[PDB]
């Protein structure tokens, strides 16, 4: 398929995606000496409505947390953009080691995982499909997570994965606002890159927020006790599913401060 595998892994990925080695690519290592401070950068401003809440999946190399995406009732605006954009999904990143699980990095330093808070363009296109292939059709927040000391935030969250242990398993998640898990400076970068996973297009205008959020080591422990294996085959533990920085490509990191 593609996965994390040293057989299928983000190495691997060019040869299904040839896009893994284009120009516009995601994560990247953001060099606070490189990054030019733009003046006309808004704030950022999200609205999520806890009612869009829906799901949460098991999709064998990581899990999502989905969101009714019908209407604005959950919204990004401000930073970089003049369309509003709409939630439709959040999910993390993390590493074998609690030294390397983050996908961005900040000169140079590796955080522990990595909150992924996902948009679509809605005033553009008509659905997630339509936007995700386009160049101004997604927006993702990123929140470098920084272990140490547990987060409260996280525990609807955690509680939930025990329902959706292996590949394919999903249960409602219902009534929760993913604004609670964003750091409380909305200070950030932006630059344009791409999906972080195939199919890898270079859709997403990232915000990447300059305070951490924290994580213990015992809650990114339960990330990687999840399964990738289908319910009955032996447990694959989802140990990692972080993938290496890519070359900036002659891209500006824009710094909102
Ligand atoms: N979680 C997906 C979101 C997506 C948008 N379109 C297709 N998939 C990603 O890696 O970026
Ligand atoms: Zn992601």
């Given amino acids: 398929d593609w996965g994390y595998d040293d057989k299928n892994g983000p190495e691997q990925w060019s040869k299904l995606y040839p896009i893994a080695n284009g120009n516009n690519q995601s994560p990247v290592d953001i060099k606070t000496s490189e990054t030019k401070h733009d003046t006309s950068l808004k704030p950022i401003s999200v609205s999520y409505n806890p009612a869009t809440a829906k799901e949460i999946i098991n999709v064998g190399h990581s899990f999502h947390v989905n969101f009714e995406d019908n209407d604005n009732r959950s919204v990004l ?13 959040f999910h993390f990143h993390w590493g074998s080691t609690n030294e390397h699980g983050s996908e961005h990095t900040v000169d140079g330093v590796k955080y522990s995982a990595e909150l992924h808070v996902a948009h679509w363009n809605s005033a553009k296109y ?9 160049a101004d059709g997604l927006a993702v927040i990123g929140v470098l ?7 409260p935030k996280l525990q ?5 994965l025990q329902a959706i242990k292996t590949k394919g398993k999903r249960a409602p998640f219902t009534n929760f606002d993913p604004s609670t898990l964003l750091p409380s400076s909305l200070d950030f970068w932006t630059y344009p890159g791409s999906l972080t996973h195939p199919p890898l ?5 990232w915000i ?3 305070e951490s959020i ?7 422990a339960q990330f990687r006790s999840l399964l990738s294996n289908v319910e009955g085959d032996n447990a694959v533990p989802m140990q990692h599913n972080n993938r290496p920085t890519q070359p900036l490509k002659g891209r500006t990191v824009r710094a909102s401060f």
Avoid: H, W
């Fill in 156 to 160: 609807k969250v955690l509680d939930a």
């Fill in 214 to 220: 924290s994580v213990s080591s015992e809650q990114l």
């Fill in 201 to 205: 297009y270079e859709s997403v205008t």
């Fill in 77 to 89: 605006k401000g930073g970089p953009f003049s369309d509003s954009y709409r939630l439709f999904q």
């Fill in 126 to 134: 008509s659905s997630l499909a339509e936007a995700a292939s386009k």
């Fill in 208 to 210: 990447i927020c300059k």
């Fill in 145 to 151: 997570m920084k272990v140490g000391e547990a987060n």
